[PDB]
Design a protein around this ligand. Sequence first.
Ligand SMILES: *Cc1c(COP(=O)(O)O)cnc(C)c1O
Ligand SMILES: *Cc1c(COP(=O)(O)O)cnc(C)c1O
Ligand SMILES: *Cc1c(COP(=O)(O)O)cnc(C)c1O
Ligand SMILES: [Cl-]
Ligand SMILES: [Cl-]
Ligand SMILES: [Cl-]
Ligand SMILES: [Cl-]
Lengths: 524, 55, 511, 515
Amino acid sequence: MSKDYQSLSPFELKDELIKIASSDGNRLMLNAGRGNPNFLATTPRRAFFRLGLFAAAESELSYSYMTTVGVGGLAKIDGIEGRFERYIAENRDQEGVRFLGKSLSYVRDQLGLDPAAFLHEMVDGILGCNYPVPPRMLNISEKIVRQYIIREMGADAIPSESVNLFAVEGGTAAMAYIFESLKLNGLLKAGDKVAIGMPVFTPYIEIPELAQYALEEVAINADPSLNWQYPDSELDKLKDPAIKIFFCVNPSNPPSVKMDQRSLERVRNIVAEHRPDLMILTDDVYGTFADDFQSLFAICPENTLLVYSFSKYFGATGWRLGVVAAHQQNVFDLALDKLQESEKVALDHRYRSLLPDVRSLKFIDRLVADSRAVALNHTAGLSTPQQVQMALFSLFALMDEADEYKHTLKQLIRRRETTLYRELGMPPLRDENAVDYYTLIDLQDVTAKLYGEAFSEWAVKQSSTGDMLFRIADETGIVLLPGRGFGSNRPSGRASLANLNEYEYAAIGRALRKMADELYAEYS
Amino acid sequence: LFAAAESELSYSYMTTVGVGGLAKIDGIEGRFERYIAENRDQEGVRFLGKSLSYV
Amino acid sequence: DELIKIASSDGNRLMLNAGRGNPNFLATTPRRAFFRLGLFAAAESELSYSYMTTVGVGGLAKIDGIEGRFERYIAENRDQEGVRFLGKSLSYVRDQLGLDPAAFLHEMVDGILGCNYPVPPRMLNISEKIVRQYIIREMGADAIPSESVNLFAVEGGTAAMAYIFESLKLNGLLKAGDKVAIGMPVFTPYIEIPELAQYALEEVAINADPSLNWQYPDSELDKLKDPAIKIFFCVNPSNPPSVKMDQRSLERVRNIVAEHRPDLMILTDDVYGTFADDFQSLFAICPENTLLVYSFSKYFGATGWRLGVVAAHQQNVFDLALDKLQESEKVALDHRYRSLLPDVRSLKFIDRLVADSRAVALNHTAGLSTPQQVQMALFSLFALMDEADEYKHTLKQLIRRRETTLYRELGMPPLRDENAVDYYTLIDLQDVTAKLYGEAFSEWAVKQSSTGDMLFRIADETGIVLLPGRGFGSNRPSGRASLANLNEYEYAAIGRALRKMADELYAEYSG
Amino acid sequence: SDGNRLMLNAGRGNPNFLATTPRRAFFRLGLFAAAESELSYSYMTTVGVGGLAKIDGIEGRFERYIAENRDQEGVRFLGKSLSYVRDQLGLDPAAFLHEMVDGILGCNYPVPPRMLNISEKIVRQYIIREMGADAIPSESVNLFAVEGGTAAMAYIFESLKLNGLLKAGDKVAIGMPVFTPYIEIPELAQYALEEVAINADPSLNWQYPDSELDKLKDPAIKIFFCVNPSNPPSVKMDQRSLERVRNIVAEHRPDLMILTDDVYGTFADDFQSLFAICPENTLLVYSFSKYFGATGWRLGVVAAHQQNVFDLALDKLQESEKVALDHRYRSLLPDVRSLKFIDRLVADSRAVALNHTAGLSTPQQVQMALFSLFALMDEADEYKHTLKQLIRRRETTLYRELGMPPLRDENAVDYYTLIDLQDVTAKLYGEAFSEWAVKQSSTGDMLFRIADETGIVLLPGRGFGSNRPSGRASLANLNEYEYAAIGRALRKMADELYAEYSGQAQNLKLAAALE
Ligand SMILES: *Cc1c(COP(=O)(O)O)cnc(C)c1O
Ligand SMILES: *Cc1c(COP(=O)(O)O)cnc(C)c1O
Ligand SMILES: *Cc1c(COP(=O)(O)O)cnc(C)c1O
Ligand SMILES: [Cl-]
Ligand SMILES: [Cl-]
Ligand SMILES: [Cl-]
Ligand SMILES: [Cl-]
């Protein structure tokens, strides 16, 4: 397939290169531009499996008949704290159990929630024996996860009670649901313009283009000379009232830098002074990998729909865990109040089965209903075991006051960067906005640092992206994404610093150094 | 629980937080067989062992 | 001399006889890992012995199926620290270095049993790959392709220097009368060796300047431009001053080699590097001109293990110098190494170190014992796997705590800068007296005492012998302590003794 | 193959057996030591950092470790070790335990450098017993621990040169045949010594004839260099030979230096070293490699008697030579004329100035002391008998189809065995055939046939001067089916030589019946 990559003829060369890839991880980058982590948070997963064993015993205590097979009943909330405290006490030597005991203290003692309700939500939830209720998100899991979201998005000033979440099957489901609900509710109409922060991976460029949404894309271009920050002139394009929504991945993918303070402030001022109606849709999956991250959701909560995925930070791509966050008073609901009477009446009919007064149905709840064709709203929602795992990842981050996990992953990314660039003039100079979950390996910069500016200009002209990607693939079996495009004046390639082990980054550096040495030998 | 151990066998660095790597397919039958042999008294484990035979 | 007499102890004797402070701390996790690995290996060996007997006899461990058996041992012992470390080690080698896991485990098991001669003799295959990653990292030599670094495992830096001077002489790279520039001050043994009649080298001092916090001035380093100086011999971080060469200094040498002395040999002893902040070796700066000697002794608390390596870049000035010898010298060398290989002119200097270490003919049974190479690899893994440098911070904080305890009654520790290492610390009478009672008093006090009075007195009240101050000359009463070999109350006792002496000096002076 | 290459490159067979009890005792001692270190570390920390073990109270703590681990083989051995050192050698038990604990942690430089104090006393008891040197008071023997016999020979030749005991052109008598490395070292240009062969006689079963030993009476021969038991022949010098050397030293050459390598002594029956016969004239080199299957550990010792011919020769150097040595060794002590040769070996091994940090690593010395204790405490020699029976089992397997093993006498060692075609064919088909087969065949065809069918390369039989097709194998480095394959290949070859001899004979008869 290779959609992201493609986005003796030159075409067939590209096809041959794609065929070299041999791992699911390499193919995921070529097809969809995502780096699947090869690390994962184990403590909250062990806590999840240990909670399940406790829950299985709680279920068997509720089965009343002598049975030859394993059948259980529903766990009881009465007496649950004491039974859970016995389980904790009998298993102090099991890491997952110790984590569960601390998480109960955090929720009961720091969040101030009902301990038996928490334990029962977690036990019944991990048994997966009841439909999610309410469908938008389990009650205590929502309060736990939103504390995590607010902290990592740098949105401390927003009172936590003003934030609501819809738990979904990763950012992948969130985007599918959000675009469908914006169309269904007349918030995005045929011909409307969608401003997109670019560069961005292909799936997000593609969604608005679907014929089912007659949308026009307007590029808000990141500037390489500014280390991929969006210049004020680009951000100012958001002033055109024709742009109904600003769609952004922050930290970005592929550049992998977070928006700096100047950029965030610019957007905040454009919104307060010129576009109080602007809808913002931001995907902040990489936030925790940045230093002192602050989301567009923290800056303009009333105008932003935040999409947060747990996939990359917790190494949970296969768990499909995400949330859509909205402030209680937002521009989407303001926009719904402004629809023409004809659209409002059609929506009264569409959601009539949900509640008496549809005009009072908030957009975040329309997302839930639309995700399952409305009529099935009562059985909608993310599975309860998924919500439980999501809550345990959240508690793991929240209870780690010194951010040990976050520091561990950031040092791992830097260690890999050093290994990759060792033989290429060392890692590129970083700054406070660098995230580097993805890295751009530029031929001009590498050859310059190694043999000087003059050799480098002769080198890029002598070479090509295709040449570079082929030499690396042929020697290591790893196919990098084209950094700029096969026709570029500056041959470059991109790799994720999350999906390979050190000797593979070393091999890539060695293949590239070798190519640089042979070019210089010729230039000698 | 077996998979968490498999993931931790793939983590290369010293750390005080629990971090694991991707589980390896090489030698997996042997490690699974050891897990099964050591936990013959746990109901879930006997079931996993028979599942392998069925498949 | 008189000091050892009034204060007898192995620690004191070592300080005066060898100018070294033996660490009183040691890395234990990789040691427990070594002993646990040994228990696994003993069981592997016993199961390879085919006959029944009550006697403890074992056979050779088998490589086939070794990973599965090792994984069972790890899974069965999650509660033994040494075993968990071994489990992480397997992943680091398999997953981060990308080396064959069965080969790594068999090299470690076979190696700890010590049942086979080291092969190749220069260094076991996988231990070399593991240890060079550790060397490259701590020497701050990241820009050097690691496949270009080769190592010869030796019985500590002590064996390294002996091997190196003998091989440089035997191969005509350092002839009697050649000038050797030495970074001074340096401890006595390095002053003495080049001057043995056996080598008869002429020493040229590159003097560290106390007024620059013991860095070498550009004027001193420029002496290297003199072509008669064939080699620059340096301990960095230095012993006794204990500071690392600053950026200005390393760049000065790099320019000299690049612009004036492409042929200069460099021999650097960087055993204290890990105790410095952001250390960078001359090997990282001039890899093709430098023979690096690295000892595991001080950092790991492993003086008794005798673990060291000699590192060389695959393309280096020593082999260029071998290529530039006169043909008649080459012919003599062909006859010397004839038994080793058909084409002696292709024999690299690092492989000559190995052969010369055991009189050439015994080359195939030369090299560091295999259990020593296994322990060296485990110390190296322990540092590589410690991404946050926790062990390093712990030792640095321990050094600082001792320094604070030592100087508490002496005006506090001397102002530290980015190049400070302080494995050895200078206690200067004038400086201490100045901080306590004023420069006026310190100029007087200094004429009232002397290095000998100071040392004899401290040794008599505390049982501790300091190294006499070296580097200024003699003009200044002063002594050096190691912050690595004593416990807190002993540093407190030294400070107490010096303060009392300062207080008596002041009592007089005041009246 | 590495084992095959070792035989070809170094002329030695690496054992495939090893002493495990003393190794388990070493790893268990280490775990005890690690906990001792951790208890001397005073600060809370996340990483494993330890302090130095304390001697105060060490016996009680060690006794608790022993009592709590009665089920671990290594631990029982350790407990008996303490009794042996304390109750039989009469040494300080706390000092012994602290030397072993601090030693195995490898946290202090070896002191004194020549050898740890207690390890030296323990190892010399073992050396004296296995070398058959009991008549020598053990206090009269000093040892220098080194990195195997390999390091010993390098240090010894270098020290003999540096101190002027052997000068260019001096003659060195060498017991032959001997393996290659020892013929090559004396001829290096850096030594330039003249070699004089002392040839073992195959008709004397590889013993040195008196006429050969008598070559030592030549005053120009400064040293006799011998490997005993020998390699490659693998026989120990008999009583007659030892006595001949003893009489020559006593009557004609009181000044003769003897350098003997006795690594194979424990494989011989009732071994006696030249060191036991002429202690004052001999430097003994003993390696632990072969007997304990410890080639990778590199454990060796150089042994010298307190009063020896080496120090006498240093006292007889020209005053000009002593003045130069006064300068070489000045940093070590004030009276260089009192520095004994065994201590110059130590200083010279590390360029003199690094003397105080010279010496074998302490964990190596601890392992060597445990191998020594294991042998000393094995009163009935069970380990030795076990190894000898394994060697004999392999020998039986090798020769089963070759007419059974050759007749062994009281001087046989057979760590290496000589497969002599003349003997094998005589045993299979008679002397007449045997006399004919020795003329038809060659060592080269023997080695090629075996290598061709089995993958195993043997060493050519050396020492004969009358074309005797033969090859040598080590009985220490292969498994039974490999020795069986070697025997099968040889039997096949003997059968083809026989069919041909038989055919020629029948033809000779038919040809005559036609005339
Ligand atoms: C990796 C990635 C995600 C995660 O999507 P999920 O469906 O939640 O796994 C989201 N957005 C971007 C830009 C990504 O690169
Ligand atoms: C302590 C130290 C060493 C270590 O020598 P080893 O033989 O390796 O124990 C080396 N050089 C210097 C300058 C040191 O002070
Ligand atoms: C096997 C062997 C040795 C052992 O040498 P090390 O260096 O001690 O391993 C010594 N001498 C001879 C003749 C040998 O055959
Ligand atoms: Cl657990
Ligand atoms: Cl179960
Ligand atoms: Cl342990
Ligand atoms: Cl044991």
